[PDB]
Design a protein around this nucleic acid. Structure first.
Lengths: 180, 262, 73, 124
RNA sequence: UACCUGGUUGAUCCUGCCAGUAGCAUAUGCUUGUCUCAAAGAUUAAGCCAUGCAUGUCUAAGUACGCACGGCCGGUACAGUGAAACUGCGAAUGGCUCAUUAAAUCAGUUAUGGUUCCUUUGGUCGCUCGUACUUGGAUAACUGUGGUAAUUCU
RNA sequence: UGGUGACUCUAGAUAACCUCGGGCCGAUCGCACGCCGGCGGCGACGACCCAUUCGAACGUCUGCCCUAUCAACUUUCGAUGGUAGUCGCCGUGCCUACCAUGGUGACCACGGGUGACGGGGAAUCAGGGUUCGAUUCCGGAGAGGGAGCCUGAGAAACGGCUACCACAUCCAAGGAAGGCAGCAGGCGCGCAAAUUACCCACUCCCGACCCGGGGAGGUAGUGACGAAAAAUAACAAUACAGGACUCUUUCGAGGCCCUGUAAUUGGAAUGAGUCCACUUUAAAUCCUUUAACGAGGAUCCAUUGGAGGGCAAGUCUGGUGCCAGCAGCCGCGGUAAUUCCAGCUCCAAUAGCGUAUAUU
RNA sequence: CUCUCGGCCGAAGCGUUUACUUUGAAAAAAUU
């Protein structure tokens, strides 16, 4: 007996049909849109959305005045507004089902970086995040799949330690400036 | 097993202790005492997890051996000594007194008391027998056996005991129209007036209890604990007034709190 | 297994002793010797040919004298 | 200069004769601060001598700004000696651990089990 | 994501299987830059085991005459710390395994008004009308004498 | 007197009894010492019995996988019941005597099997289900095989003893010592599994006991079992190429974005690494934090499978000639091979990807 | 659905008894 936790999930489901042109092409398109490493990122997103839709489904079957349906539903809607996928007016349980994969890929950090004019391309944004140039509030974020919340979005900066941000030039600049 | 067990694992430990899942392999096995190990706080958990005074078991020990902690007006040096319901914990160096009373949710709340109130505790009688030359004995839920009590006192009644003497003072009889708390089961920690008790021979007697907010619920008689004559309690009551909040209303409360303090 | 201490080398010796032996097929069906000590008694020194005295342990099978003997090189 | 000490969850243990606290350290440019410096800083904050305070468990956050540790400021040095875990007293040279390994002393024990009487003191 | 595709024929529609497909488990092949977690001699042999280790323990409080110790002040019975040994307690927990075992174990449920229960916790402990301002005999540790090839032997 | 749903309960009175292998009715210690010559305050060990806790141990009810190529089974030696007893901590065929002739069974008894410890659970799944659960929590069982004990509150204990069987070490030939299904490690077995590492710093447990001890446990090491995150480049100027907006009958001409080739350049940005220090920590390591060095493609070079159909991707080139081979299946090969071995090219998955097996 | 004892009410019986449904108290944590 040890003091260790063996709890862990798989965070994606591999598709049933491995080769269908519609699917492959679609996922490729998605990838190209939001600058992702492989199919598995897309699949992760798909899995999460699927989970959400399951949750929403298993609530609608209960009575309108059933407490569980109310409370849990309200929580779920809150969670989906707090990330910035749904809208405050469309905060009813049925609207959850009409969500798309891309609407969750839009709230990824990379995409935010791209949109906010900190980067020039999606790949460029990704790289900027990876190299530790992008911070959120004050915390430096290395992970690009970091889902940006609605309230936290209004301050995504360039991190004081980076060359683009505060100052102190990088390595290449140091090397070139110390030639003669 | 060949004999009695001396160990308890953290996973098998009772939930209302609010222990972790990763700090160690073993929970602190409560020493045999006045309370059943399922429904009690060991002194260690209360001292280091609730109050945070100590950080480790060693630190806890270093307090218990310096003889600062008094449970029911008596110095206990054992770190695993079980303090249960209605139990008075006194630290004199800080000048702080706590009584173990169940929270609304079913856990042991850190409930601070006045030094005036800390002089007495309440006891549910478990059994009354007459033994040796016509001497009747009460036996309370805290294993405290009191010789020569009031002949009016019957089973399932609550008595007030002054801790300095160890003698009974005055009692509340179990009757419809008395304020109660639950000591075990689903409704644990909930407070209300007794509505109606129904008897079942050869089984547990189901007792109905009405809330302050009109929420009627039921329990077993072994789990009920009388407190108040009519409506007003004989002891202080936790910050949550014993009325169990539903989830939605709790959420609402939380939201309100968030709003108010920014 | 690392060799640094005499304690480490003792662990190695122990490992070499209790080991699953790979039985090499050629060795097992014949009978062989390693030389521990070699002595030479020439019949005639001018001939430069004499009697050899190879002393060591028989390892393969039961060594029969009627059979020939081959020295490796 | 650019180092800043803030004190979070602060509590006085009168049953232990100490001042228990959480410490946030801001050091935006530099590395993690050596413990001595932080001890000094805390001393200068709380008016007391640096000799009596102990700090432990400093984990710097990802990115490189905040560092969060636990620190306790005892009343007297004697009280500190009497209450603190002995390895934290060894970091200030107040305690010395025996240089023997576990294995050796196990072996010795097992040897001395075998012989009776005064001969337990001879075998080592 | 309540999903099917190839294969019986000159061609067709069927029954029907075989094959594909996706997981999840053990093994294994090739390959492997970083980082957070993380199973791991179960399966076959509940087969055998070199060596080392895993249960020991003292307070103001049972017994100190080991100069073993610096040390009191000296007729100061016992200043103190204290190896040992007697005593008390622990070793019936933990850890390991899954061989046996099929209403057996086990689970939920009930009983003990049919029993025992270290310790803790509470009660009780001049309720008996009949040398004590202190009882006896040993035995360790210690000294010394030994035996046996050898043992945690005596 | 008092109490339960109910006592042959507790409590009361009377007559007695009370084991010598005997039941309680303190021949014990520590701390401060103080009061009318005599009295005392805290605490430690105790102690018959009550309670209590930790339990245990016996019962009740209902709930298991396969098999009829197991249909009758159980009773002479207890089978089912009655009475009396013995034993047992207690209730009982638990045992003994004496009686009766029962009890179970197609609602599957009994017998046999199980690649059967039981649960909590896991995997898969629309709904229903099917399969797994040796594995860290609870319960059970056994320490080579069986059997019997001592001490103890508690054991039919095995890091106790006593035997016999099976193994097996040292022997001076007389005897002595065994028990890793504890933690390492070894052999053997196999398709199949880690270091004779450091530490009681945590979690806890045991102990006369704040102090001692603990291969319980923690920490490292091995670790592609498995799960989470996530690099292997980004950008600008050029030279083309598209797709657009404005102007021209159209050709066209412009300043509008996007795309690769760049056998073109260009500087910036970084981690892998290398490596002071700090931190972490029982002591370390790792991570995190940070000085310096660290990136131009012959590198700091990405792999495994496949490319007729199923099934995403070549009637490309060379070799082979029903040979070698491939191919889950359908089939490919007998001289133009889209299927073999290569080269080139492309596709799928991507730090993973094949293959065999159990299973959904 | 009701006569008996107590403070219009609580005890006393129920009602042929189930099966069924709903509710109530219990059903260890971890996992889910």
């Amino acid at each position: 007996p040890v003091a260790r936790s063996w709890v862990c999930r798989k965070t994606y489901v591999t598709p049933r049909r491995p080769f269908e042109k519609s699917r492959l092409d679609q996922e490729l398109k998605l990838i190209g849109e939001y600058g992702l490493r492989n199919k598995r990122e897309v699949w992760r997103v798909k899995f999460t959305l699927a989970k959400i839709r399951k949750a929403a489904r298993e609530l609608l079957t209960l009575d309108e005045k059933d407490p569980r349906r109310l409370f849990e539903g309200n929580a779920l809607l809150r969670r989906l507004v707090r990330i910035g996928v749904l809208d405050e007016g469309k905060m009813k349980l049925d609207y959850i089902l009409g969500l798309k994969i891309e609407d969750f890929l839009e709230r990824r950090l990379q995409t935010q970086v791209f949109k906010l004019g900190l980067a020039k391309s999606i790949h460029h944004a990704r790289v900027l995040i990876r190299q530790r140039h992008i911070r959120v509030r004050k915390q430096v974020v290395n992970i690009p799949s970091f889902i940006v919340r609605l309230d936290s979005q209004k301050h995504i900066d360039f991190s004081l330690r980076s060359p683009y941000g505060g100052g102190r030039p990088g390595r290449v600049k140091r090397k070139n400036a110390k030639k003669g | 097993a060949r004999g009695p067990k001396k160990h308890l694992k953290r996973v098998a430990a009772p939930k209302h202790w609010m222990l972790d899942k990763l700090t160690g392999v073993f929970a602190p096995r409560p020493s045999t005492g006045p309370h059943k190990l399922r429904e009690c706080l060991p002194l260690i958990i209360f001292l280091r997890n609730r109050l945070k005074y100590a950080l480790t078991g060693d630190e806890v020990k270093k307090i218990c051996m310096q003889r600062f902690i008094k449970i029911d007006g008596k110095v206990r040096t054992d770190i695993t000594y079980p303090a249960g319901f209605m139990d008075v914990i006194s630290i004199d160096k800080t000048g702080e007194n706590f009584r173990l009373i169940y929270d609304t949710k079913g856990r042991f709340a850190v409930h601070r008391i006045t030094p005036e109130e800390a002089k007495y505790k309440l006891c549910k009688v478990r059994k009354i027998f007459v033994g040796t030359k016509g001497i009747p004995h009460l036996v309370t839920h805290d294993a405290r056996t009191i010789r020569y009590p009031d002949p009016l006192i019957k089973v399932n009644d609550t008595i007030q005991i002054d801790l300095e003497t160890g003698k009974i003072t005055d009692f509340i009889k179990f009757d419809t129209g008395n304020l109660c708390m639950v000591t075990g089961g689903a409704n644990l920690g909930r407070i209300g007036v007794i509505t109606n008790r129904e008897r079942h021979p050869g089984s547990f007697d189901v007792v109905h209890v009405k809330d302050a907010n009109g929420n009627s619920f039921a329990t077993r008689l072994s789990n009920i604990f009388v407190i108040g004559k009519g409506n007003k309690p004989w002891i202080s009551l936790p910050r949550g007034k014993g009325i169990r909040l539903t989830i939605a209303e709790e959420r609402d409360k939380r939201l309100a709190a968030k709003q108010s303090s920014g | 297994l690392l060799l640094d201490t005499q304690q480490e080398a003792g662990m190695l010796l122990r490992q070499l002793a209790n080991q699953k032996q790979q039985h090499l097929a050629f060795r097992d069906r014949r009978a062989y010797l390693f030389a521990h000590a070699v002595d030479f008694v020439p019949s005639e020194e001018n001939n430069l040919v004499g009697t050899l005295k190879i002393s060591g342990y028989v390892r393969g099978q039961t060594l029969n004298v009627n059979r020939l003997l081959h020295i490796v090189g | 200069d650019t180092v800043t000490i803030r004190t979070r969850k602060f509590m006085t243990n009168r049953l232990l004769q100490r001042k228990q606290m959480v410490i946030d350290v801001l050091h935006p440019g530099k590395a993690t601060v050596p413990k001595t410096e932080i001890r000094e800083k805390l001393a200068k904050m709380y008016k007391t001598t640096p000799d009596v305070i102990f700090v432990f468990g400093f984990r710097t956050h990802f990115g490189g700004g905040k560092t969060t540790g636990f620190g306790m400021i005892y009343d007297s040095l004697d009280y500190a000696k009497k209450n603190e875990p002995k390895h934290r007293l060894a970091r200030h040279g107040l305690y010395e651990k025996k240089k023997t390994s576990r294995k050796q002393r196990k072996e010795r024990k097992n040897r001395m089990k075998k012989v009776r009487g005064t001969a337990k003191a001879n075998v080592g």
